[PDB]
């Protein structure tokens, strides 16, 4: 059943053809269960660790290194009676890496806790119905409720389905709808039509929404919808639309996967063209068994050389460390990549209530009457400080602290605030904070009474649990509450009837203390309290007081105001009927006006300063709130989202006003406006979506169920530590201490991390370049591979491993938070930078093949000098006569390859220094800057020496140590790499773009 809010109750009843005093028949229920299904949200799984690892071995690139693992496996099985000893270390070091990279791939991409499950917390197991087969209410499984059911809800109930209210049995029905609005202040419901077809939830004052709860009262309704066709079901569906997105760089990775997986396919058929080049002269001396196997040997070496394995690890490590740094600021990152995604954020959307503000309603202004001089009426105004329910803060007069007990009118105000009140305050020993018990707007009065301390009660030595209600208790000892005239919609006030406690001195006679909406309470006042005296309420006085109250209600203030009054001479208890709320207004007449209090939900202290820092970093903050527009704009002004006099006509929108815009203007509104109010959970995700459709990287901050969709849609979702489980499990990061400042800190960390990543990804790739250049030089020319897989694997995973991780520890820049956010599209190399290490890569790729072949010809030991014969080793077995003065096995010596590797290891270790900075020469930026880079290379170096000098190591890696002349030759053929790039920096810091 649709549009239940605009139908009258008779139309809803007639639609299902049921009586409110009977309900559906059990047969009808059966038919509706068929037709509409059960009243429950579908669970959303998330692949077993099975289908996750499987998906790690799916993306093309990863297969390339599996190919060269199976091929490596075969070309290590049918290994001659020679060294089948360690031929399998290759197809295993590889087969091992792919294992490790998967387990890690999943340990960071997997979101443990499920936000749809948390949401089901709001689905009660049980609901109450009236069905035709019994007169009395029936308590059943909620999932068995169907459209058409007559349902009964009561105080403390979770509402089981979307329900048109038929009949309110209590005097009021007060509903907490925070899961759809973020607001915890009770909604007072009624049963009349809400004609607007486009009514937003905050307007549907005659509806009950599944998953909200009843803060008070009793009602009967008819179920309009169940299952996913409910408001909470829409939230469930937006969280189920699981886009499993990915970090900008993580999409760069996924991208480069496609990049590198073709570069290899091309280079392999390219090695094949130069392999088929001397296919026209094989002299068929070794058939093709030798040829089709020397070609796979090459593929495995190229594939291995191209893929920069170990990359996944240095990154994961970088991220994880980042996570550790943020945890120390009280930012709990739940997704490794996110720690860095925040860095490129350009727009931060934010819930207001409980996010930007404390979600703790606070009396911050009050007034009583000081003097009435005929027509003129002087008010005594005070402000009150503090922003939580904690009874911490002081009452100020002109900004200076005063003792509330000095003023008789305040004693009376406190008395009414304390007594005309169904709530209290409680100190939660487990969370370490004060919490309300009852309505927010009432607990604010409770808190006020504690701050006011009008009897100067000693409270400094109380436990926090006793302190919670101390000054309210002292007032209870003076006046005994005898009964309450509860709130009704017609009068918009409530009152409590009180007698002076036994042993008066207080003051003889019974009293009624009244609070309510100003206009109705003041209209029923005939007198005004001035100190302890009472004077007649006149028109001009009534008008001054109403005017000031109206200013408080619409200011830069926009406070909720209550007027406080007391009936000085109540009726006698016996003349009043308590069972009829319709009589209460009359009993609360002939009142004496006492004062007014104004409360708001105030900003957290750090928010303003954080917004400014964001602005300084080129980040926009947009408030998106379920709350009213007036309050929303006012809070925006207090926190510097808007100027205090800025005109915001087209900078602030309700969800409706936003919906009214042409679809084109909706997109543009999102770039211009910074406040969206009276919004539904969908509006928040829609705005995030628009933002993202300008390719803005966008964050969402929230604490509520109504933020869950936006939290899921944003590139980065951020939840408040003290907010809902649902919002937390929908996030990438949680601010455990609710400190908004931490977001600013997280951005910096993220920019720091982004800079170090991109360059250690360059350092690691410049490497994989030379290797390819080499595994291709020593392939096309027909030379004996200068390096083989098992060695490359060590280099890329370990030799370059440490140093890369060292670079992820370089110091962040000093202006890092004075730049605008980097563009999402920004590559990782451009023009100058690409050919930069295609030059450093052309050097490594060569200087390695060139120090291995050196050991042949112009080197001492030194088979050796063969020249054109060296590029022709295939015919040493066959065409031996050519090779006279040499053996036919010394073409497979460890020394030459140890020369090659020792060059790479030496070039890369150097290439790690020119990686410390992008442009700043080592001249102007010392190599002693990042000490950890030093310990990093000395480790890589001392590991290199190892696999050269340890009985096993050199056989598994095919190395044979180098003389001190074999190392002078290495250095004098490696170090120059520094001067090379070093001059590439001098030609970029001046004549390029600096
Ligand atoms: N228990 C209580 N005792 C006394 N006064 C109360 C009260 N609960 C609410 N009020 C006062 O009476 C008014 C009645 O609230 P009501 O149902 O009219 O909502 P609202 O006007 O705040 C709703 P909306 O934002 O959707 O238009 C409140 O604004 C408040 O001043
Ligand atoms: C088993 C497994 O999950 C993985 C792997 O096995 N790896 C990475 C990877 O994620 C591969 C990868 C995909 N996209 C990129 C970009 C840059 C670098 C890498 C990758 C490393 C790749 C490899 C093969 C080491
Ligand atoms: K997200
Ligand atoms: Mg909120
Ligand atoms: Mn992977
Ligand atoms: Mn109202």
Q: Nominal resolution in Å?
A: 2.5
What is the CA(360)–ligand 4 centre distance, in A?
A: 11
Burial zone of 332 (CB within 10 Å; 0-12 exposed, 13-18 middle, 19+ buried)? middle
What is the CA(188)–ligand 6 centre distance, in A?
A: 7
Annotated binding residue 47: no
Alpha-carbon distance values, 965 to 378, 848, 898, 945 (Å): 100, 17, 13, 15
Residue from 122, 677, 716, 607 nearest 354 by CA: 607
Beta bridge pairs of residue 158: 213
Decide: helix, strand or coil at residue 588: coil
The Cα–Cα gap between 927 and 371 comes to 77
Token pair, residue 69, equals: 């693992």
Token pair, residue 107, equals: 């340990």
Decide: helix, strand or coil at residue 368: strand
The Cα–Cα gap between 728 and 24 comes to 40
Token pair, residue 160, equals: 């089981």
Residue indicated by tokens 């907490």: 176
Annotated binding residue 678: yes
* 748 φ/ψ angles, rounded to the nearest 5 degrees: -60, -50
The Cα–Cα gap between 703 and 355 comes to 6
Q: Do domains 12-54+113-240 and 359-602 have the same CATH topology?
A: no
The Cα–Cα gap between 738 and 607 comes to 11
CATH architecture of the domain with range 346-358+603-745: 3-Layer(aba) Sandwich (3.40)
Query: Contact 230/209 with Cβ under 8 angstroms?
Result: yes
* 943 φ/ψ angles, rounded to the nearest 5 degrees: -85, -35
Running DSSP on this structure, what letter comes out for residue 567? E
Phi/psi zone of residue 642: left (φ > 0), alpha (ψ -120 to 50 degrees), beta? beta
Write out the DSSP string of 502-546.
Answer: SS-SS-SS-EEEEEE-HHHHHHTEEEEEETTEEEE--HHHHHHHH
The DSSP bridge pattern shows strands 376-384 and 162-168 to be unpaired
Residue from 821, 803, 707, 740 nearest 313 by CA: 803
Residues with CB under 5 A from ligand 4 (ion): 182, 351, 353-354, 703-704
* 991 φ/ψ angles, rounded to the nearest 5 degrees: -95, 0
Token pair, residue 411, equals: 């004693």
Q: Ligand 1 — pocket residues by CB below 6 A?
A: 188, 202, 487, 492-494, 515-517, 562, 628
Annotated binding residue 768: yes
- Deposited experimental method: X-ray
Boundaries of every domain in the chain: 12-54+113-240, 55-112+241-345+746-994, 346-358+603-745, 359-602
Annotated binding residue 515: yes
Whose atoms come closest to the Cα of 828: which ligand? 2
The Cα–Cα gap between 246 and 251 comes to 6
Token pair, residue 565, equals: 């009054």
Residue from 434, 437, 451 nearest 395 by CA: 451
Q: Which atom of ligand 1 is nearest to the CA of 518?
A: 31
Phi/psi zone of residue 478: left (φ > 0), alpha (ψ -120 to 50 degrees), beta? alpha
Residue indicated by tokens 């690892």: 53
The Cα–Cα gap between 710 and 704 comes to 11
Query: Contact 418/475 with Cβ under 8 angstroms?
Result: yes
Running DSSP on this structure, what letter comes out for residue 812? P
Token pair, residue 929, equals: 């800057």
> Measured between alpha carbons, how far apart are the two ends of the chain, in Å?
67
Token pair, residue 985, equals: 């920096």
Residue from 668, 623, 616 nearest 642 by CA: 623
Query: Contact 788/897 with Cβ under 8 angstroms?
Result: yes
Catalytic, 203? Answer no
CATH architecture of the domain with range 55-112+241-345+746-994: Up-down Bundle (1.20)
For ligand 1, atom 5, name the residue with the nearest CA: 516
The Cα–Cα gap between 626 and 717 comes to 18
Alpha-carbon distance values, 24 to 150, 166, 210, 713 (Å): 7, 15, 20, 40
The Cα–Cα gap between 394 and 386 comes to 7
Residue from 843, 762, 760, 765 nearest 308 by CA: 765
What is the CA(727)–ligand 3 centre distance, in A?
A: 11
Q: Which atom of ligand 2 is nearest to the CA of 99?
A: 1
Q: Which of 149, 162, 176, 351 is catalytic?
A: 351
Whose atoms come closest to the Cα of 337: which ligand? 3
Q: Which residues contact 454 (CB under 8 A, 6 or more apart)?
A: 404, 405, 410, 411, 414, 415, 471
Alpha-carbon distance values, 73 to 92, 437, 586, 656, 760 (Å): 8, 69, 94, 64, 31
For ligand 2, atom 24, name the residue with the nearest CA: 62
The Cα–Cα gap between 708 and 718 comes to 10
Q: Where are the alpha helices (DSSP H) in 342-439?
A: 408-419
Decide: helix, strand or coil at residue 153: strand
Element (H, E) at 802: helix 801-807
Instruction: Kindly compute the dihedral angle of the four CA atoms of residues 594, 600, 601, 602, in this order, to the nearest 10 degrees.
Output: -110
Token pair, residue 913, equals: 């220094």
For ligand 1, atom 17, name the residue with the nearest CA: 188
The Cα–Cα gap between 59 and 911 comes to 30
What is the CA(140)–ligand 1 centre distance, in A?
A: 34
Q: Where are the alpha helices (DSSP H) in 75-192?
A: 90-109, 115-119, 178-181
Ligand 1 mutation target, pool 441, 522, 625, 654, most atoms within 8 A of CB: 441
Q: Which residues contact 541 (CB under 8 A, 6 or more apart)?
A: 372, 375, 377, 528
What is the CA(112)–ligand 6 centre distance, in A?
A: 43
Residue from 121, 103, 111, 99 nearest 41 by CA: 121
The Cα–Cα gap between 817 and 741 comes to 14
* 538 φ/ψ angles, rounded to the nearest 5 degrees: -115, 170
The Cα–Cα gap between 538 and 544 comes to 10
Write out the DSSP string of 372-422.
Answer: EETTEEEEEEEEE--SSSSS---EEETTEE--GGG-HHHHHHHHHHHHS-S
Beta carbons within 10 angstroms of residue 369's beta carbon: 23
Residue from 537, 550, 531, 567 nearest 368 by CA: 531
Query: Contact 708/232 with Cβ under 8 angstroms?
Result: no
Report how far Cα 901 is from the mean position of its chain's Cα atoms: 45
The Cα–Cα gap between 269 and 513 comes to 92
Burial zone of 235 (CB within 10 Å; 0-12 exposed, 13-18 middle, 19+ buried)? buried
Alpha-carbon distance values, 407 to 410, 469, 720 (Å): 5, 22, 40
Write out the DSSP string of 768-798.
Answer: HHHHHHHHHHHHHS----SS-HHHHHHIIII
For ligand 2, atom 17, name the residue with the nearest CA: 253
Element (H, E) at 167: strand 162-168
Q: How many CA atoms lie within 13 A of 915 on its CB side?
A: 32
Per-state percent for the chain, helix, strand, coil, to nearest 5: 45, 15, 40
What is the CA(111)–ligand 3 centre distance, in A?
A: 11
Report how far Cα 905 is from the mean position of its chain's Cα atoms: 41
Q: Which atom of ligand 1 is nearest to the CA of 517?
A: 31
For ligand 1, atom 1, name the residue with the nearest CA: 487
* 162 φ/ψ angles, rounded to the nearest 5 degrees: -75, 120
For ligand 2, atom 11, name the residue with the nearest CA: 62
Residue from 254, 270, 169, 258 nearest 219 by CA: 169
* 451 φ/ψ angles, rounded to the nearest 5 degrees: -75, -40
Running DSSP on this structure, what letter comes out for residue 352? I
The DSSP bridge pattern shows strands 675-677 and 207-208 to be unpaired
Whose atoms come closest to the Cα of 307: which ligand? 2
Q: Ligand 2 — pocket residues by CB below 6 A?
A: 56-57, 59, 61-62, 65, 98, 101-102, 105, 253, 256-257, 307-309, 311-312
For the domain made up of 359-602, give the CATH fold: Calcium-transporting ATPase, cytoplasmic domain N (3.40.1110)
Q: Rounded to a whole number, what is the largest CA-CA distance in the chain?
A: 132
Burial zone of 79 (CB within 10 Å; 0-12 exposed, 13-18 middle, 19+ buried)? middle
The Cα–Cα gap between 455 and 449 comes to 10
Query: Contact 916/933 with Cβ under 8 angstroms?
Result: yes
Query: Treating both helix axes as pointing N-terminal to C-terminal, what angle do 894-911 and 931-948 enclose, rounded to 10 degrees?
Result: 180
Q: Which residues contact 585 (CB under 8 A, 6 or more apart)?
A: 488, 490, 491, 493, 524
What is the CA(188)–ligand 1 centre distance, in A?
A: 7
The Cα–Cα gap between 902 and 958 comes to 12
Query: Which CATH class, in words, describes the domain spanning 12-54+113-240?
Result: mainly beta
* 376 φ/ψ angles, rounded to the nearest 5 degrees: -80, 150
Query: Contact 797/743 with Cβ under 8 angstroms?
Result: no
Residue from 399, 404, 433, 434 nearest 417 by CA: 404
The Cα–Cα gap between 372 and 366 comes to 18
The Cα–Cα gap between 857 and 178 comes to 82
Beta bridge pairs of residue 567: 512
The Cα–Cα gap between 149 and 12 comes to 11
Using H for helix, E for strand and C for coil, what is the string for 817-869?
CCCCCCCCCCCCCCCHHHHHHHHHHHHHHHHHHHHHCCCCCCCCCCCCCCHHH
User: Strands of 675-677's sheet, edge to edge?
Assistant: 331-333, 733-735, 716-720, 698-702, 347-350, 620-624, 675-677, 652-654
Contacts by 647-652, CB closer than 8 A, 24 or more apart: 648/675, 651/675, 652/676, 652/677
């Amino acid at each position: 059943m649709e549009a239940a809010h605009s139908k009258s109750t008779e139309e809803c009843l007639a639609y299902f053809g049921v009586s409110e005093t009977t309900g559906l028949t059990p047969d009808q229920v059966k038919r509706h269960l068929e037709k509409y299904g059960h009243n429950e949200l579908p669970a959303e799984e998330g692949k077993s660790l099975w289908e996750l690892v499987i998906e790690q071995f799916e993306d093309l690139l990863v297969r390339i290194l599996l190919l060269a693992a199976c091929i490596s496996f075969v070309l290590a099985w049918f290994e001659e009676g020679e060294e089948t000893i360690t031929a399998f270390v290759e197809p295993f070091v590889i087969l091992l890496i792919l294992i490790a990279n998967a387990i890690v791939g999943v340990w960071q991409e997997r979101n443990a806790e499920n936000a749809i499950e948390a949401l089901k917390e709001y689905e009660p197991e049980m609901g109450k119905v009236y069905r035709a087969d019994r007169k009395s209410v029936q308590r059943i499984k909620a999932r068995d409720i169907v459209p058409g059911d007559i349902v009964e809800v009561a105080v403390g109930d979770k509402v089981p389905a979307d329900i048109r209210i038929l009949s309110i049995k209590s005097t009021t029905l007060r509903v907490d709808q925070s899961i759809l609005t973020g607001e915890s202040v009770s909604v007072i419901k009624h049963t009349e039509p809400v004609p607007d077809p486009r009514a937003v939830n905050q307007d549907k004052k005659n509806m009950l929404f599944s998953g909200t709860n009843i803060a008070a009262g009793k009602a009967l309704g008819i179920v309009a919808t169940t299952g996913v066709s409910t408001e909470i079901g829409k939230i469930r569906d937006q969280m189920a639309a699981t886009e499993q997105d990915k970090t900008p760089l993580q999409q760069k990775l996924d991208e480069f996967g496609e990049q590198l997986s073709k570069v290899i396919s091309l280079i392999c058929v390219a090695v094949w063209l130069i392999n088929i080049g001397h296919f026209n002269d094989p002299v068929h001396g070794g058939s093709w068994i030798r040829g089709a196997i020397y070609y796979f040997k090459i593929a495995v070496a190229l594939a291995v050389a191209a893929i920069p394995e170990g990359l996944p690890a240095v990154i994961t490590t970088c991220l994880a460390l980042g996570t550790r740094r943020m945890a120390k600021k009280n930012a709990i990152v739940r997704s490794l990549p996110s720690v860095e995604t925040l860095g490129c954020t350009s727009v931060i959307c934010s819930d207001k209530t409980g996010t930007l503000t404390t979600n703790q309603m606070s009396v911050c202004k009050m007034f009583i009457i000081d003097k009435v001089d005929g027509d003129f009426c002087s008010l005594n105004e005070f402000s009150i400080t503090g922003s939580t329910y904690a009874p911490e803060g002081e009452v100020l007069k002109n900004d200076k602290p005063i003792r509330s007990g000095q003023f008789d009118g305040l004693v009376e105000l406190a008395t009414i605030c304390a007594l005309c009140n169904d709530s209290s305050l409680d100190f939660n020993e487990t969370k370490g904070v004060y919490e309300k018990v009852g309505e927010a707007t009432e607990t604010a009065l409770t808190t006020l009474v504690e701050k006011m301390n009008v009897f100067n009660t000693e409270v400094r030595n109380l436990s926090k649990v006793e302190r919670a209600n101390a000054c309210n208790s002292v007032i209870r000892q003076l006046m005994k509450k005898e009964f309450t005239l509860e709130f009704s919609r017609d009068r918009k006030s409530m009152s409590v009837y009180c007698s002076p406690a036994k042993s008066s001195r207080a003051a003889v006679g019974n009293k009624m203390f009244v609070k309510g909406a100003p206009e109705g309470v003041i209209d029923r006042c005939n007198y005004v309290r001035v100190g302890t005296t009472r004077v007649p309420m006149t028109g001009p006085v009534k008008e001054k007081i109403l005017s000031v109250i109206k200013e408080w209600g619409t200011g830069r203030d926009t406070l909720r105001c209550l007027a406080l009054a007391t009936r000085d001479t109540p009726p006698k208890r016996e003349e009043m009927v308590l069972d009829d709320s319709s009589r209460f207004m009359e009993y609360e007449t002939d009142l004496t006006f006492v004062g007014v209090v104004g409360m708001l939900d105030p900003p957290r202290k750090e928010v303003m300063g954080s917004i400014q820092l964001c602005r300084d970093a080129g980040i926009r903050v947009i408030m998106i709130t379920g709350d009213n527009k007036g309050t929303a704009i006012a809070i925006c002004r207090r926190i510097g989202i808007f100027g205090e006099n800025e005109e915001v006509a087209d900078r602030a929108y309700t969800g409706r006003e936003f919906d009214d815009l042409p679809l084109a203007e909706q997109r543009e509104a999102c770039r211009r406006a910074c406040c969206f109010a009276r919004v539904e959970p969908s509006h928040k995700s829609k705005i995030v979506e628009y933002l993202q459709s300008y390719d803005e990287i966008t964050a969402m901050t929230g604490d509520g169920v109504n933020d869950a969709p936006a939290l899921k849609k944003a590139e980065i979702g951020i939840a408040m530590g003290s907010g809902t489980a649902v919002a937390k499990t929908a996030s990438e990061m949680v601010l455990a201490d609710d400190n908004f400042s931490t977001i600013v800190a997280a951005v910096e960390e993220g920019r720091a991390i982004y800079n170090n990543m991109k360059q250690f990804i360059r350092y690691l790739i410049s490497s994989n370049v030379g290797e390819v250049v080499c595994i291709f030089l020593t392939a096309a020319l027909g030379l004996p591979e200068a390096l083989i897989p098992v060695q490359l694997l060590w280099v890329n995973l370990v030799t370059d491993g440490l140093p890369a991780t060292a670079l992820g520890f370089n110091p962040p820049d000093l202006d890092i938070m004075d730049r605008p956010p980097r563009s999402p599209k920004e590559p990782l190399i451009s023009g100058w930078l690409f050919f930069r290490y295609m030059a450093i890569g052309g050097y490594v790729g060569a200087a390695t093949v060139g120090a291995a072949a050196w050991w042949f010809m112009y080197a001492e030991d030194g088979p050796g000098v063969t020249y054109h014969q060296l590029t022709h080793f295939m015919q040493c077995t066959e065409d031996h006569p050519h090779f006279e003065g040499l053996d036919c096995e010394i073409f497979e010596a460890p020394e030459p390859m140890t020369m090659a590797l020792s060059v790479l290891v030496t070039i890369e270790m150097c290439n790690a220094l020119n990686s410390l900075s992008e442009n700043q020469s080592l001249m102007r930026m010392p190599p002693w800057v990042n000490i950890w880079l030093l310990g990093s290379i000395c480790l890589s170096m001392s590991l290199h020496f190892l696999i050269l000098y340890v009985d096993p190591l050199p056989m598994i890696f095919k190395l044979k140590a180098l003389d001190l002349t074999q190392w002078l030759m290495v250095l004098k053929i490696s170090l120059p790499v520094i001067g090379l790039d070093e001059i590439l920096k001098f030609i970029a810091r001046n004549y390029l773009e600096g």
